[PDB]
């Protein structure tokens, strides 16, 4: 056929391009960290805690990683990283032996479809599985040395879903309040703030169904404990203010993009600014006051978009990931700024930066606390990269 | 290279004429006034300006999606 020949060609081209980008990096970033895992991951979460040992030049951070192996035993993992915390220090930068190390392994039944730590307790995390339920765990209650037998204490799994999903969000203000979203076209809500009789069985307190398509994502409010929206392939965003008691008719519902919506995120520093992400290769945004206005559109991704995340430490900085093996960085201030024809042929102004590391569909990324401008990225090629852009770009 | 396509006469003193271009690329057809005729028989444009979506039509090897048959979500 043709597609085979064509793909061989495309592969060789991508290889060349990565060669070039690597040769060119030194003038581009303030940090380059690459590390290969045995099995890839599908998760990313920076632990909100940081320790910095004295007499040295580096910090220490802990990361929350998942695992989707081929066939063998699945695991939940959290490992260690030694970020340089210094400006004058530079074997490589610090010790010679190692800068990354695994520390936490837990047996897991099925792959990991999602994993987030609870905001109130980082020792509490959730887990989406190939099954139709939810698992919760507290690592401090299990040894890092994994059970050579296999499956172990599910640590209060949940119930109320019928197909798998990917949505996951604790309520920031209210403990125990956690939302879910699966192929069931439904949103299931447990409240584990108080389950003395665990029994590994808790059913979702409330189950919402307003989308008639497979739901894609859900996120709580950032200030309100009784507010959150919804995302399905319906290309319909529905506003779900709880305490109104209707799992059928939400508070609001409009069409966001012409293609199915995938990812969704709210600005922390503001009250109203929403960040939306869809399959439309588009990026839109909205406000809680009025909604019948697609505020703006970022139009440079060349395939679907699967993740959006605002910046901590920065009010006007956002991030767009997808499948194009690229990663974008925008700017809300430079909206329509007259630029030179060469600045324009470079690109539109408001687009701020584009990451050029990975060579596969960028699975997932994350900001972190404890550090101003750094993000880790995970692809499907067993690849983990951490970087810091050069400084000169801003200011 | 453009070619006249449709010859529409406006009710006023105007006859807009439709143009299409030989490479059959991303570009759409265009309505031209007979006054602007003989001025745009052929057009040349820099690459950074072309219609993004339908730019790929030149080549599969422009850009692909390597899985090309997605198995997981």
């Amino acid at each position: 056929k043709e597609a085979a020949f064509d793909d061989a060609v495309e592969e060789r081209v991508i290889n060349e391009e990565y060669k070039i980008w690597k040769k060119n990096t030194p003038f581009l970033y303030d940090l380059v960290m690459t590390h290969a895992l045995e099995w890839p991951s599908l998760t990313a979460q920076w632990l909100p805690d940081v320790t910095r040992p004295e007499g040295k030049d580096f910090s220490i951070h802990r990361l929350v990683l998942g695992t989707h192996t081929s066939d063998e035993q699945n695991h939940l993992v959290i490992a260690s990283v030694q970020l340089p915390n210094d400006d004058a220090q530079f074997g490589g930068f610090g010790s010679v032996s190692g800068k990354i190390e695994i520390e936490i392994k837990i047996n897991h039944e099925g792959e990991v479809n999602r994993a987030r730590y609870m905001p109130q307790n980082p020792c509490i995390i959730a887990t989406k599985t190939p099954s139709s339920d939810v698992l919760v765990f507290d690592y401090t209650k299990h040894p890092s040395k994994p059970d050579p037998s296999g499956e172990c204490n599910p640590d209060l799994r949940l119930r109320g879903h019928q197909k798998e999903g990917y949505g996951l969000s604790w309520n920031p203000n209210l403990s125990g309040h956690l939302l879910s979203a699966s192929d069931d076209h439904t949103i299931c809500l447990w409240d584990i703030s108080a389950v003395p009789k665990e029994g590994k069985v808790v059913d979702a307190k409330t189950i919402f169904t307003g989308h008639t398509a497979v739901v894609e994502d859900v996120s709580w409010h950032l200030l309100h404990e009784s507010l959150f929206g919804s995302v399905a392939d319906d290309q319909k965003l529905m506003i779900w203010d709880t305490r109104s008691n209707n799992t059928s008719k939400p508070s609001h519902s409009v069409d966001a993009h012409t293609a199915e919506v995938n990812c969704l995120s709210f600005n922390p520093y503001s009250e109203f600014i929403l960040a939306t992400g869809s399959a439309d290769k588009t990026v839109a945004l909205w406000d809680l006051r009025n909604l019948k206005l697609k505020l703006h559109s970022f139009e440079s991704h060349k395939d679907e978009i699967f993740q959006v995340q605002w910046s901590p430490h920065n009010e006007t900085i956002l991030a767009s990931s997808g499948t194009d093996r690229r990663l974008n960085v925008w700017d809300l201030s430079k909206i329509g700024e007259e630029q030179s024809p060469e600045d324009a042929e470079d690109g539109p102004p408001e687009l701020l930066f584009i990451h050029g590391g990975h060579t596969a569909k960028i699975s997932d990324f994350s900001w972190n606390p404890n550090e101003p401008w750094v993000i880790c990225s995970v692809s499907e090629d067993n690849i983990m990269q951490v970087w810091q852009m050069a400084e000169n770009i801003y200011n | 290279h453009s070619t006249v396509i449709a010859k529409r006469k406006e009710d006023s003193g105007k006859i807009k004429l439709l143009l299409h271009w030989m490479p059959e690329d991303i570009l759409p057809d265009v309505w031209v006034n007979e006054s602007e005729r003989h001025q745009l028989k052929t057009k040349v444009v820099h690459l950074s300006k072309l219609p993004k979506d339908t730019a790929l039509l030149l080549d599969p090897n422009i850009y692909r999606t390597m899985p090309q048959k997605r198995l997981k979500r």
């Binding site: 081209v13 060349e16 391009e17 | 850009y63």
Partner: peptide, 26 residues
């Protein structure tokens, strides 16, 4: 001196960047 050598050699790297030119441009 079969100058095709000088030709064939410097032939190879050219087309590559050439393609790459257009690609990156878009």
């Amino acid at each position: 001196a079969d100058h095709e050598l000088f030709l064939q050699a410097f032939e190879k790297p050219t087309q590559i960047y050439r393609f790459l030119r257009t690609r990156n441009l878009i």
